[PDB]
Design an enzyme around this catalytic site. Sequence first.
Site, mmCIF file in Angstrom:
data_model
loop_
_atom_site.group_PDB
_atom_site.id
_atom_site.type_symbol
_atom_site.label_atom_id
_atom_site.label_comp_id
_atom_site.label_asym_id
_atom_site.label_seq_id
_atom_site.Cartn_x
_atom_site.Cartn_y
_atom_site.Cartn_z
ATOM 1 N N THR B 92 0.876 -1.155 0.000
ATOM 2 C CA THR B 92 0.000 0.000 0.000
ATOM 3 C C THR B 92 0.929 1.225 0.000
ATOM 4 O O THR B 92 1.607 1.475 0.939
ATOM 5 C CB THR B 92 -0.954 0.064 1.200
ATOM 6 O OG1 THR B 92 -1.701 -1.125 1.261
ATOM 7 C CG2 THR B 92 -1.892 1.233 1.054
ATOM 8 N N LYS B 167 -8.109 2.069 -3.567
ATOM 9 C CA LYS B 167 -8.033 1.677 -2.162
ATOM 10 C C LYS B 167 -7.949 2.921 -1.252
ATOM 11 O O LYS B 167 -8.569 2.941 -0.221
ATOM 12 C CB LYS B 167 -6.848 0.841 -1.861
ATOM 13 C CG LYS B 167 -6.744 0.443 -0.401
ATOM 14 C CD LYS B 167 -5.607 -0.541 -0.089
ATOM 15 C CE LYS B 167 -5.542 -0.760 1.420
ATOM 16 N NZ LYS B 167 -4.467 -1.679 1.751
ATOM 17 N N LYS B 242 -2.015 4.909 8.723
ATOM 18 C CA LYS B 242 -1.158 4.773 7.541
ATOM 19 C C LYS B 242 -1.891 5.098 6.235
ATOM 20 O O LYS B 242 -1.427 5.888 5.440
ATOM 21 C CB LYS B 242 -0.556 3.360 7.486
ATOM 22 C CG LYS B 242 0.128 3.066 6.127
ATOM 23 C CD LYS B 242 0.920 1.760 6.121
ATOM 24 C CE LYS B 242 2.091 1.710 5.151
ATOM 25 N NZ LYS B 242 1.670 1.162 3.838
HETATM 26 N N1 LIG Z 1 -1.119 -5.926 7.898
HETATM 27 C C1 LIG Z 1 -2.280 -5.757 7.293
HETATM 28 O O1 LIG Z 1 -3.280 -6.071 7.808
HETATM 29 C C2 LIG Z 1 -2.335 -5.174 5.912
HETATM 30 C C3 LIG Z 1 -3.504 -5.154 5.162
HETATM 31 C C4 LIG Z 1 -3.476 -4.601 3.902
HETATM 32 C C5 LIG Z 1 -2.298 -4.092 3.421
HETATM 33 N N2 LIG Z 1 -1.217 -4.081 4.153
HETATM 34 C C6 LIG Z 1 -0.009 -3.529 3.546
HETATM 35 O O2 LIG Z 1 0.905 -4.509 3.202
HETATM 36 C C7 LIG Z 1 2.226 -4.067 3.223
HETATM 37 C C8 LIG Z 1 3.020 -4.963 4.161
HETATM 38 O O3 LIG Z 1 2.408 -5.095 5.401
HETATM 39 P P1 LIG Z 1 2.802 -6.111 6.521
HETATM 40 O O4 LIG Z 1 1.747 -6.050 7.428
HETATM 41 O O5 LIG Z 1 3.103 -7.364 5.945
HETATM 42 O O6 LIG Z 1 4.075 -5.446 7.155
HETATM 43 P P2 LIG Z 1 5.309 -6.201 7.772
HETATM 44 O O7 LIG Z 1 6.174 -5.203 8.298
HETATM 45 O O8 LIG Z 1 4.856 -7.192 8.626
HETATM 46 O O9 LIG Z 1 6.042 -6.907 6.592
HETATM 47 C C9 LIG Z 1 6.942 -6.266 5.726
HETATM 48 C C10 LIG Z 1 8.228 -7.048 5.536
HETATM 49 O O10 LIG Z 1 9.058 -6.536 4.544
HETATM 50 C C11 LIG Z 1 10.386 -6.779 4.888
HETATM 51 N N3 LIG Z 1 11.277 -5.982 4.020
HETATM 52 C C12 LIG Z 1 11.701 -4.731 4.154
HETATM 53 N N4 LIG Z 1 12.484 -4.377 3.134
HETATM 54 C C13 LIG Z 1 12.558 -5.407 2.323
HETATM 55 C C14 LIG Z 1 13.185 -5.706 1.035
HETATM 56 N N5 LIG Z 1 13.929 -4.795 0.417
HETATM 57 N N6 LIG Z 1 13.006 -6.932 0.544
HETATM 58 C C15 LIG Z 1 12.254 -7.824 1.166
HETATM 59 N N7 LIG Z 1 11.631 -7.610 2.283
HETATM 60 C C16 LIG Z 1 11.757 -6.456 2.905
HETATM 61 C C17 LIG Z 1 10.414 -6.536 6.387
HETATM 62 O O11 LIG Z 1 11.488 -7.167 7.003
HETATM 63 C C18 LIG Z 1 9.086 -7.138 6.799
HETATM 64 O O12 LIG Z 1 9.162 -8.494 7.198
HETATM 65 C C19 LIG Z 1 2.147 -2.617 3.695
HETATM 66 O O13 LIG Z 1 2.271 -1.749 2.616
HETATM 67 C C20 LIG Z 1 0.782 -2.534 4.360
HETATM 68 O O14 LIG Z 1 0.169 -1.280 4.275
HETATM 69 C C21 LIG Z 1 -1.211 -4.592 5.352
#
Ligand SMILES: NC(=O)c1ccc[n+]([C@@H]2O[C@H](COP(=O)([O-])OP(=O)(O)OC[C@H]3O[C@@H](n4cnc5c(N)ncnc54)[C@H](O)[C@@H]3O)[C@@H](O)[C@H]2O)c1
Lengths: 290, 291
Positions: B92, B167, B242
């Site tokens: 996102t 979104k 966010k």
């Molecule tokens: N958590 C939710 O409920 C939810 C719902 C919809 C959308 N999102 C979106 O999804 C995305 C991720 O969310 P999340 O909840 O999984 O966050 P998260 O922090 O749990 O996961 C993100 C991961 O990316 C890794 N990372 C960072 N840099 C990296 C790179 N260069 N290569 C590979 N990995 C890397 C981090 O170590 C981490 O494990 C965000 O943009 C968030 O807005 C989340």
Amino acid sequence: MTTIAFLGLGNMGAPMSANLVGAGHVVRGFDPAPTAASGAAAHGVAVFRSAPEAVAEADVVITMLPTGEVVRRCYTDVLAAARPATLFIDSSTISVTDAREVHALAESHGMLQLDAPVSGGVKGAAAATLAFMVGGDESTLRRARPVLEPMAGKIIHCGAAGAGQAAKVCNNMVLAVQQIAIAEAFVLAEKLGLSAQSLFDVITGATGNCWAVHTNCPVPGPVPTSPANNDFKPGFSTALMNKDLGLAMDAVAATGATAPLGSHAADIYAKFAADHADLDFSAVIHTLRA
Amino acid sequence: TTIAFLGLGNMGAPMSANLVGAGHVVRGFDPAPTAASGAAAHGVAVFRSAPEAVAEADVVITMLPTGEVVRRCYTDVLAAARPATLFIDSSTISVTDAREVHALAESHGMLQLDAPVSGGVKGAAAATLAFMVGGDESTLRRARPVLEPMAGKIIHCGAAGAGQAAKVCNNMVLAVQQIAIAEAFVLAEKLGLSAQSLFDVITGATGNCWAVHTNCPVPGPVPTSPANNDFKPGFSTALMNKDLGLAMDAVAATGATAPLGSHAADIYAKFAADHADLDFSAVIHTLRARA
Ligand SMILES: NC(=O)c1ccc[n+]([C@@H]2O[C@H](COP(=O)([O-])OP(=O)(O)OC[C@H]3O[C@@H](n4cnc5c(N)ncnc54)[C@H](O)[C@@H]3O)[C@@H](O)[C@H]2O)c1
Ligand SMILES: NC(=O)c1ccc[n+]([C@@H]2O[C@H](COP(=O)([O-])OP(=O)(O)OC[C@H]3O[C@@H](n4cnc5c(N)ncnc54)[C@H](O)[C@@H]3O)[C@@H](O)[C@H]2O)c1
Ligand SMILES: C[C@@H](CCC(=O)O)C(=O)O
Ligand SMILES: C[C@@H](CCC(=O)O)C(=O)O
Ligand SMILES: C[C@@H](CCC(=O)O)C(=O)O
């Protein structure tokens, strides 16, 4: 079949009263605007020279009036004229405070009383598909039901006196907030290059869906029946929304509630009403462009 | 299909497990060991660097925290990918950043979509996510079999950046609606109108929306809503904050007028300072900070 006095034969009261006459009630009407009274007479209401005379031999008295002040004055004028234990139904939209005051006034005169404001507008009124949101005693609503039915698509008991007004005003505050929010989303989408049809399809299939978009879509195209497609002709006028929001702000002020978005919406619609009272309240989108 | 999955966090880990479960070869990278280990334990082959994961991939999926990280990841992997690799960003991020990373990927001869999601970790695990997609129709068709095992819904929103825009617009409205519903329940209470009574009316009337019919912020009328479970998300205030930040970016970038959305953003930013872990419906209890 009962005798009903109907005080207020205007945009809403005229078609309401006509449905009562159609259902076989004897309807005794009064309205100080002779144009209103004449139209009502044409559809079988017996029109009287004064409100006291209309209520004098009525089982039920319905008011469909512009404001809480006008309701209060009407009650003061007519309560002593009515037979003891006559059922008063106020279907005006007025403040919860004013509803509670007029309810108590009616009761101190020995009359039953409900608040039963409605939603559906003139179209709903003519088609007898209004929603009645009722405050008062359950037994009194039981006595009223046969009178409300030929005007209604829905009758919902909301609580004690004033709860009908309260439920309506809460819903309408939410509606005003949603209509502006939906408008803000469509204009942002346009500026981002996301098509109106595309945003419509998304929101309506997602958590943001609501009547303000699915039925009242403020951009022409996705909902061809919405006002946006008919020059923003009401529909639900900005004037009326501004009234209802003023009533919501009265309720906020009377309770000490905090309603930041509802109060912000009220401000927005008060300004928009200064020059666009006659447009559907979805027309507020104009203010967000440019 | 061989898929490289970059970002194996809260969302990326269950997503990638569904891809393994549907018969894909999944290659992974995440700089957090606990994420990478958890992913390897469900069949992802984890590599020590993002370019290594991408090297033999037909599809590269990013699920990363911000547009800045997505941008860096793209410049850090694009040279390592094969021509006509399909890049799908499900992060996102801002519409601006989405469009920039799309054009970057395409200038390397890749095919690229923005495909951000709704549905949370529960949706991710259950494979019921809603993907909102921007990009070319033909590219979405190619992607569909990869998205399907993660998805309950896949919607084409328009050209690159339209998924993010859709979104962000829906969620700005949702935030406004969740606060508006809270205000209505508190007003109703002060007026002596019971919560069940207001619920019955609004859910039958023009004010109805998910924020009340499913997320009702007072306990009782919808026994599954977060209000009945100490406001456990659900959809956290942290995430709502966010998304509204991104909505305010879009508003500033376009010069749009969004008074209620901006007001909601202000409200949630302040609420997130104290209750970021609670479902966003918990905003009902912070309204007197606004008095
Ligand atoms: N958590 C939710 O409920 C939810 C719902 C919809 C959308 N999102 C979106 O999804 C995305 C991720 O969310 P999340 O909840 O999984 O966050 P998260 O922090 O749990 O996961 C993100 C991961 O990316 C890794 N990372 C960072 N840099 C990296 C790179 N260069 N290569 C590979 N990995 C890397 C981090 O170590 C981490 O494990 C965000 O943009 C968030 O807005 C989340
Ligand atoms: N018009 C709508 O779409 C709509 C929809 C829902 C609810 N309402 C509410 O219904 C109420 C009436 O609306 P309307 O549109 O019929 O207004 P209106 O102004 O058309 O009619 C009110 C009528 O009351 C009459 N009146 C004033 N004082 C009177 C008295 N003492 N005795 C008898 N009659 C008197 C007026 O002469 C007028 O004809 C308002 O409170 C309004 O908020 C209107
Ligand atoms: C919304 C309602 C229609 C009745 C009415 O018009 O009030 C219903 O579904 O029964
Ligand atoms: C609203 C009323 C229906 C009468 C009618 O359909 O006019 C009812 O049965 O509650
Ligand atoms: C997203 C797709 C379902 C594919 C699946 O989840 O198996 C669809 O609903 O069309």
